[PDB]
């Protein structure tokens, strides 16, 4: 599924990401935009053998288990396939654990490079929420 900007903003708000652990909603929409271009089925194989999965490109080496990644730790205790659904529930649940680490949203490289320091609120403006 490819979410519309406002469609995802509304969904993430329903999924409790507005002001979760100090991060305003715009951060999450912006992150999804640059991490997966709002595509819930997005996947990217990394050189270290790991793969990033879903709308928030969650990594198989530290967060989910896809059964094919070396030093997998499965910090989110969930199979990566669950992060490839049109339903964002699992991706949001795992993202919430990731951001609860001291590194916060810096775990998301695209967010760090294209969102951090920008007017992230712009990503939720012009939307019915």
């Amino acid at each position, epitope marked *: 599924k490819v979410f519309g900007r406002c469609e995802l903003a509304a969904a993430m708000k329903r999924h409790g990401l507005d002001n979760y652990r100090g991060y305003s909603l715009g951060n999450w929409v912006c992150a999804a935009k640059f991490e997966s271009n709002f595509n819930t089925q997005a996947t990217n194989r990394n050189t270290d053998g790991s793969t990033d999965y879903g709308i928030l490109q969650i990594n198989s080496r530290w967060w989910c288990n896809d059964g094919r990644t070396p030093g997998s730790r499965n910090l989110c205790n969930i199979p990566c396939s669950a992060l490839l659904s049109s339903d964002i529930t699992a991706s949001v649940n795992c993202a919430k654990k990731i951001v609860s680490d*001291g590194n916060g949203m810096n775990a998301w490289v695209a967010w760090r490079n294209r969102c951090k320091g920008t007017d992230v609120q712009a990503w939720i403006r012009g939307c019915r929420l």
Partner: antibody
Amino acid sequence: DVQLQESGPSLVKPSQTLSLTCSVTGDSITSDFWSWIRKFPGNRLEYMGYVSYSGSTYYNPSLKSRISITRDTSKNQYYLDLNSVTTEDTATYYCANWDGDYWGQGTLVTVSA
Amino acid sequence: DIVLTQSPATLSVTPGNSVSLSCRASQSIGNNLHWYQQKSHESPRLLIKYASQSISGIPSRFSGSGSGTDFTLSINSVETEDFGMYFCQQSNSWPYTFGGGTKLEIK
């Protein structure tokens, strides 16, 4: 399967440092975030803090920075240190994973002269 | 900190009847409210996560609802094994906080 278990002294003196150990069996501590929670005499629960995979810690401001949560991978255990305790620290202490799916049995620690 | 207020403080019910427990937050916490059950001389047990999400291994009679500042835990047809304490906990902001708890006991 995973199992958590608290251990340490059940009786401590005011002003001393209370130290508890949580032994994890079934998986590595490097594969989760670990927390400490305590229950006071009147069914009052307090989330003390947790240590995440990067080593970063989050402590409840209520503890006035008297708390330390550390880990030891070689022994697959994590710890709780609470400095300068008072009778207000008497409570049942529990260790549990961040997700809240696994909890230790809990251990009562009483602070008294 | 975010303050969670639970009500009623105590609720008596006859097995077979249904009940609903309330938990209100001092500020909006989205869906970041979880429910725990705790029996005498026992560690807490997670029943519902993120306001309404089910937990594997928990009886289906337990369900949660709500968002923002008002949440409810419902038990459809209370069983004897359900008597004990119920606490809500928020994970929206640090420090995580617990409600004062509601005691569920047989009439």
